[PDB]
Amino acid sequence: SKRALVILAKGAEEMETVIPVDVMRRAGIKVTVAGLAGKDPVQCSRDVVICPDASLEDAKKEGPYDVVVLPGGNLGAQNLSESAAVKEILKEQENRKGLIAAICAGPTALLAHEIGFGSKVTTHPLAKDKMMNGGHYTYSENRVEKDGLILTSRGPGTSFEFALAIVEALNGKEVAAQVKAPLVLK
């Protein structure tokens, strides 16, 4: 089975966390929800409290992962951006030619850690100016943007598309179609 690391920080957007975790698990991906600050429950941007599967410290020991997923959330992405541990995980994933996926404000952590410079990326419209500071990427308005091993998306309302793009990248178009079928997507 393919494996996914979802890094969960205080202030993460809980929809952008839960939709990818759930959709990936429907696809048969083994997902580890890893708490940035350890194993304790994480208060998300609208106060939903999610209990991680493991601390990031422990989850990094059980890698590598076929995808590292970064949810958004204003404070969540800021916490991801400030973490030396996240920087190392993202640098290693980039070096082993592994997929990195980030949604909404999540891609601004790629900028903070100098990941994937020169990629075509999207973000939430409100995060565009922060992501484009320094001209280190090319911007896209697409709801999901995949440029090689850098996969980005825009908002809670693109989370299903984002998650199914991860599933397609890891498990193929047929598995993604299977998972999509009962979701009643528009």
mmCIF file of C-alpha atoms in Angstrom:
data_model
loop_
_atom_site.group_PDB
_atom_site.id
_atom_site.type_symbol
_atom_site.label_atom_id
_atom_site.label_comp_id
_atom_site.label_asym_id
_atom_site.label_seq_id
_atom_site.Cartn_x
_atom_site.Cartn_y
_atom_site.Cartn_z
ATOM 1 C CA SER A 1 0.000 0.000 0.000
ATOM 2 C CA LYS A 2 1.026 3.616 -0.589
ATOM 3 C CA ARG A 3 1.641 5.813 2.464
ATOM 4 C CA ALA A 4 0.808 9.442 3.272
ATOM 5 C CA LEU A 5 2.078 11.844 5.941
ATOM 6 C CA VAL A 6 -0.377 14.624 6.885
ATOM 7 C CA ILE A 7 1.266 17.244 9.122
ATOM 8 C CA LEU A 8 -1.265 18.685 11.590
ATOM 9 C CA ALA A 9 -0.373 21.973 13.305
ATOM 10 C CA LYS A 10 -2.327 24.159 15.708
ATOM 11 C CA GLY A 11 -4.649 26.390 13.711
ATOM 12 C CA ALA A 12 -4.826 24.045 10.723
ATOM 13 C CA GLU A 13 -7.959 24.288 8.617
ATOM 14 C CA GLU A 14 -9.885 21.233 9.783
ATOM 15 C CA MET A 15 -11.808 20.700 6.518
ATOM 16 C CA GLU A 16 -8.559 20.834 4.528
ATOM 17 C CA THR A 17 -7.117 18.278 6.964
ATOM 18 C CA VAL A 18 -10.021 15.839 7.244
ATOM 19 C CA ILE A 19 -11.166 15.697 3.589
ATOM 20 C CA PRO A 20 -7.731 14.555 2.295
ATOM 21 C CA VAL A 21 -7.228 12.123 5.201
ATOM 22 C CA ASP A 22 -10.655 10.553 4.649
ATOM 23 C CA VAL A 23 -10.502 10.416 0.832
ATOM 24 C CA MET A 24 -6.950 8.981 0.921
ATOM 25 C CA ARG A 25 -8.034 6.288 3.386
ATOM 26 C CA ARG A 26 -11.010 5.449 1.135
ATOM 27 C CA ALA A 27 -8.415 4.845 -1.607
ATOM 28 C CA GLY A 28 -6.507 2.362 0.555
ATOM 29 C CA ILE A 29 -3.631 4.710 1.362
ATOM 30 C CA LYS A 30 -2.150 4.251 4.830
ATOM 31 C CA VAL A 31 -2.371 7.775 6.268
ATOM 32 C CA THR A 32 -0.510 8.985 9.359
ATOM 33 C CA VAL A 33 -1.995 12.145 10.852
ATOM 34 C CA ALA A 34 1.123 13.523 12.554
ATOM 35 C CA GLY A 35 0.936 16.239 15.181
ATOM 36 C CA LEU A 36 3.511 18.978 14.673
ATOM 37 C CA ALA A 37 3.620 19.652 18.432
ATOM 38 C CA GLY A 38 3.538 15.996 19.450
ATOM 39 C CA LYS A 39 0.851 13.409 20.023
ATOM 40 C CA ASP A 40 -1.624 15.647 21.888
ATOM 41 C CA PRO A 41 -4.952 16.771 20.386
ATOM 42 C CA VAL A 42 -4.778 19.715 17.994
ATOM 43 C CA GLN A 43 -7.121 22.714 18.093
ATOM 44 C CA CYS A 44 -7.925 23.648 14.489
ATOM 45 C CA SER A 45 -8.846 27.008 12.942
ATOM 46 C CA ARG A 46 -12.571 26.739 13.786
ATOM 47 C CA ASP A 47 -11.895 24.958 17.093
ATOM 48 C CA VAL A 48 -12.500 21.375 15.931
ATOM 49 C CA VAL A 49 -10.092 19.255 17.987
ATOM 50 C CA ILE A 50 -8.417 16.392 16.103
ATOM 51 C CA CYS A 51 -6.352 13.726 17.848
ATOM 52 C CA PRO A 52 -3.230 12.846 15.815
ATOM 53 C CA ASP A 53 -2.198 9.264 15.153
ATOM 54 C CA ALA A 54 1.368 10.064 16.202
ATOM 55 C CA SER A 55 3.765 12.875 16.875
ATOM 56 C CA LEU A 56 5.653 14.189 13.858
ATOM 57 C CA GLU A 57 8.846 13.123 15.638
ATOM 58 C CA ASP A 58 7.645 9.515 15.732
ATOM 59 C CA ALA A 59 6.082 9.593 12.257
ATOM 60 C CA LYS A 60 9.314 10.815 10.628
ATOM 61 C CA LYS A 61 11.015 7.666 11.980
ATOM 62 C CA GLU A 62 8.505 5.494 10.086
ATOM 63 C CA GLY A 63 9.095 7.116 6.708
ATOM 64 C CA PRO A 64 9.632 7.672 3.937
ATOM 65 C CA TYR A 65 6.160 8.505 2.650
ATOM 66 C CA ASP A 66 4.764 8.519 -0.872
ATOM 67 C CA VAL A 67 3.191 11.940 -0.198
ATOM 68 C CA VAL A 68 3.604 14.658 2.426
ATOM 69 C CA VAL A 69 0.392 16.684 2.764
ATOM 70 C CA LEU A 70 0.203 20.246 4.128
ATOM 71 C CA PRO A 71 -3.263 21.562 5.046
ATOM 72 C CA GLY A 72 -3.886 25.294 5.224
ATOM 73 C CA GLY A 73 -5.289 27.494 7.941
ATOM 74 C CA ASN A 74 -3.717 30.901 8.568
ATOM 75 C CA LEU A 75 -2.080 29.909 11.862
ATOM 76 C CA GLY A 76 -1.570 26.292 10.798
ATOM 77 C CA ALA A 77 0.448 27.272 7.738
ATOM 78 C CA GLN A 78 2.404 29.781 9.821
ATOM 79 C CA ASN A 79 3.285 27.038 12.303
ATOM 80 C CA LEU A 80 4.299 24.717 9.447
ATOM 81 C CA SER A 81 6.412 27.541 7.971
ATOM 82 C CA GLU A 82 8.259 28.116 11.246
ATOM 83 C CA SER A 83 9.139 24.462 11.911
ATOM 84 C CA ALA A 84 12.705 23.262 11.354
ATOM 85 C CA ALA A 85 11.336 19.701 11.415
ATOM 86 C CA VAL A 86 8.916 20.387 8.523
ATOM 87 C CA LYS A 87 11.791 21.983 6.525
ATOM 88 C CA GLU A 88 13.859 18.774 6.817
ATOM 89 C CA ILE A 89 10.920 16.498 5.913
ATOM 90 C CA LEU A 90 10.077 18.636 2.872
ATOM 91 C CA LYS A 91 13.730 18.884 1.733
ATOM 92 C CA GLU A 92 14.186 15.082 1.976
ATOM 93 C CA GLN A 93 10.893 14.377 0.147
ATOM 94 C CA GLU A 94 11.928 16.758 -2.613
ATOM 95 C CA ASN A 95 15.346 15.082 -2.801
ATOM 96 C CA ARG A 96 13.968 11.532 -3.032
ATOM 97 C CA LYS A 97 11.616 12.670 -5.837
ATOM 98 C CA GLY A 98 8.521 12.242 -3.664
ATOM 99 C CA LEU A 99 5.179 14.003 -3.947
ATOM 100 C CA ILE A 100 4.420 17.090 -1.845
ATOM 101 C CA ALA A 101 0.825 18.360 -1.722
ATOM 102 C CA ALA A 102 -0.369 21.597 -0.120
ATOM 103 C CA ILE A 103 -3.742 23.379 -0.091
ATOM 104 C CA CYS A 104 -5.011 26.965 0.435
ATOM 105 C CA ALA A 105 -2.428 28.611 2.722
ATOM 106 C CA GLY A 106 -0.408 25.384 2.914
ATOM 107 C CA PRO A 107 1.731 26.271 -0.126
ATOM 108 C CA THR A 108 3.179 29.270 1.733
ATOM 109 C CA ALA A 109 5.109 26.724 3.833
ATOM 110 C CA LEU A 110 6.790 25.590 0.614
ATOM 111 C CA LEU A 111 7.974 29.171 0.167
ATOM 112 C CA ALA A 112 9.182 29.435 3.770
ATOM 113 C CA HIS A 113 11.283 26.267 3.377
ATOM 114 C CA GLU A 114 12.437 27.025 -0.213
ATOM 115 C CA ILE A 115 10.688 23.953 -1.668
ATOM 116 C CA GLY A 116 10.008 23.543 -5.374
ATOM 117 C CA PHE A 117 11.166 26.977 -6.531
ATOM 118 C CA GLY A 118 10.316 27.468 -10.181
ATOM 119 C CA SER A 119 7.176 25.340 -9.957
ATOM 120 C CA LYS A 120 3.782 26.361 -11.218
ATOM 121 C CA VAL A 121 1.580 26.631 -8.110
ATOM 122 C CA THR A 122 -1.810 27.811 -6.927
ATOM 123 C CA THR A 123 -2.958 29.033 -3.512
ATOM 124 C CA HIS A 124 -5.998 30.577 -1.978
ATOM 125 C CA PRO A 125 -6.550 33.968 -3.667
ATOM 126 C CA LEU A 126 -5.870 35.678 -0.317
ATOM 127 C CA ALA A 127 -2.495 33.914 -0.025
ATOM 128 C CA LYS A 128 -1.309 34.742 -3.563
ATOM 129 C CA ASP A 129 0.667 37.847 -2.621
ATOM 130 C CA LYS A 130 2.493 36.046 0.197
ATOM 131 C CA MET A 131 3.359 33.072 -2.027
ATOM 132 C CA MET A 132 4.547 35.281 -4.912
ATOM 133 C CA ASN A 133 6.792 37.529 -2.731
ATOM 134 C CA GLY A 134 10.200 37.159 -4.394
ATOM 135 C CA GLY A 135 8.928 35.629 -7.638
ATOM 136 C CA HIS A 136 10.015 32.108 -6.703
ATOM 137 C CA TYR A 137 7.067 30.397 -8.464
ATOM 138 C CA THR A 138 4.738 30.840 -11.421
ATOM 139 C CA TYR A 139 1.111 31.350 -10.402
ATOM 140 C CA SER A 140 -1.930 29.417 -11.563
ATOM 141 C CA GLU A 141 -5.654 29.996 -11.135
ATOM 142 C CA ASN A 142 -6.457 26.294 -11.590
ATOM 143 C CA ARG A 143 -8.454 24.695 -8.781
ATOM 144 C CA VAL A 144 -5.745 22.008 -8.565
ATOM 145 C CA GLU A 145 -2.244 22.494 -9.995
ATOM 146 C CA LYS A 146 0.195 19.604 -10.387
ATOM 147 C CA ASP A 147 3.669 20.528 -11.635
ATOM 148 C CA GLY A 148 5.708 17.354 -11.422
ATOM 149 C CA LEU A 149 5.981 16.416 -7.752
ATOM 150 C CA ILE A 150 4.520 19.708 -6.430
ATOM 151 C CA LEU A 151 0.722 19.549 -6.116
ATOM 152 C CA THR A 152 -1.227 22.581 -4.901
ATOM 153 C CA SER A 153 -4.863 23.628 -4.502
ATOM 154 C CA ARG A 154 -6.894 26.636 -3.468
ATOM 155 C CA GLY A 155 -9.443 26.227 -0.659
ATOM 156 C CA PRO A 156 -11.907 24.146 1.351
ATOM 157 C CA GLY A 157 -14.097 23.934 -1.741
ATOM 158 C CA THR A 158 -11.260 22.407 -3.786
ATOM 159 C CA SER A 159 -10.333 19.853 -1.089
ATOM 160 C CA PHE A 160 -12.120 16.912 -2.736
ATOM 161 C CA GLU A 161 -10.456 17.675 -6.079
ATOM 162 C CA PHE A 162 -7.102 18.075 -4.305
ATOM 163 C CA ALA A 163 -7.483 14.781 -2.438
ATOM 164 C CA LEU A 164 -8.560 12.880 -5.553
ATOM 165 C CA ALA A 165 -5.523 14.307 -7.391
ATOM 166 C CA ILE A 166 -3.317 12.806 -4.667
ATOM 167 C CA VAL A 167 -5.147 9.486 -5.024
ATOM 168 C CA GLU A 168 -4.692 9.579 -8.804
ATOM 169 C CA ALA A 169 -0.973 10.370 -8.443
ATOM 170 C CA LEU A 170 -0.385 7.515 -5.972
ATOM 171 C CA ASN A 171 -2.910 4.818 -6.928
ATOM 172 C CA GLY A 172 -4.016 5.731 -10.467
ATOM 173 C CA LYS A 173 -7.054 7.067 -12.299
ATOM 174 C CA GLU A 174 -9.186 3.957 -11.757
ATOM 175 C CA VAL A 175 -8.828 3.966 -7.962
ATOM 176 C CA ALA A 176 -9.563 7.702 -7.969
ATOM 177 C CA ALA A 177 -12.726 7.063 -10.015
ATOM 178 C CA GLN A 178 -13.801 4.330 -7.586
ATOM 179 C CA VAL A 179 -13.361 6.590 -4.558
ATOM 180 C CA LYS A 180 -15.117 9.493 -6.290
ATOM 181 C CA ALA A 181 -18.201 7.501 -7.268
ATOM 182 C CA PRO A 182 -20.174 7.539 -3.950
ATOM 183 C CA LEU A 183 -19.074 11.006 -2.842
ATOM 184 C CA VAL A 184 -21.960 12.807 -4.641
ATOM 185 C CA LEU A 185 -19.574 15.466 -5.922
ATOM 186 C CA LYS A 186 -20.976 18.285 -8.052
#
